[PDB]
């Protein structure tokens, strides 16, 4: 039983590593997407401010 548990745990370690790598990559992609969204919104707001200033 101890040997079976050891083998099962050492396989679950690899499974956990794969899942964690996937989740970390997903989080990085989400972060950069949010940064791009904020950049576009800020640029549009700046143009709007310039236009209101002209008015």
């Amino acid at each position: 039983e101890a040997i079976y548990n050891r083998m099962r745990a050492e396989r679950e370690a690899v499974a956990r590593r794969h899942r964690s790598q996937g989740q970390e990559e997903a989080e990085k992609l989400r972060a950069t997407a949010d940064y791009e969204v904020t950049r576009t919104l800020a640029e549009a707001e700046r143009q709007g401010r310039i236009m209101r200033g002209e008015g």
């Binding site: 040997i3 079976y4 050891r6 083998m7």
Partner: protein, 53 residues
């Protein structure tokens, strides 16, 4: 005493085994053998098939 020289005989050996790196594997094996010189097969070992298994 007749001995079935020409026929091919089959044997199955299976068991849970321990590997080198402290691991456990379920392993099976098949072995196919013939019998020659039947005097040796008959007057050497009791139940030669079990001994071979």
């Amino acid at each position: 005493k007749p001995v079935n020289v020409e026929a091919v005989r089959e044997l199955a050996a299976s068991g849970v085994m321990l590997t080198s790196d402290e691991n456990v594997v379920r392993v099976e094996m098949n072995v196919q053998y013939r019998v020659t010189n039947p005097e040796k097969y008959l007057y050497s070992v009791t139940s030669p098939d079990d001994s071979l298994r």
